[PDB]
């Protein structure tokens, strides 16, 4: 046999490529960025905090 | 004993199974995978 096996694995490769392309293209995953940076000593002596 | 020897008069009659051919032919090839490469491919 083994012709059945090679045809099968070819079809599996094609279907896997299709499904992984869908997996790559479909979702967003773009949460951008959140949270604000904490306070460090360099911030104190910057011109930003001058009263 | 008649019953015991009787269960073997229908399976040998059923040996021929389906000898009809066509969507019927491809259905026969499908429901029984051991017909061609196509049926094996879909089964697997």
């Amino acid at each position: 046999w083994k012709g059945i096996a090679i045809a099968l694995l070819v079809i599996l490769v094609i279907c896997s490529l299709i499904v992984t392309s869908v997996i790559l293209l479909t979702p967003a995953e773009d949460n951008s960025l959140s949270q604000k940076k904490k306070v460090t000593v360099e911030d104190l002596f910057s011109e930003d905090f001058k009263i | 004993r008649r019953r015991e020897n009787a269960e073997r008069l229908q399976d040998d009659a059923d040996t021929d199974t389906a000898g009809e051919s066509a969507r019927q032919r491809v259905w026969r090839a499908f429901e029984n995978p051991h017909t061609s490469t196509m049926a094996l491919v879909f089964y697997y």
Side-chain angles (χ1 to χ4, degrees), chain B residues 6-39:
Chain B
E7 293 87 5
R8 71 145 194 76
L9 282 72
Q10 53 267 68
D11 58 317
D12 45 353
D14 291 331
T15 298
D16 59 348
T17 66
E20 182 260 350
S21 170
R23 268 286 156 85
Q24 323 85 50
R25 172 179 70 245
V26 299
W27 155 251
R28 172 175 102 201
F30 196 64
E31 63 88 20
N32 182 9
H34 196 72
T35 311
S36 74
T37 299
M38 183 177 177

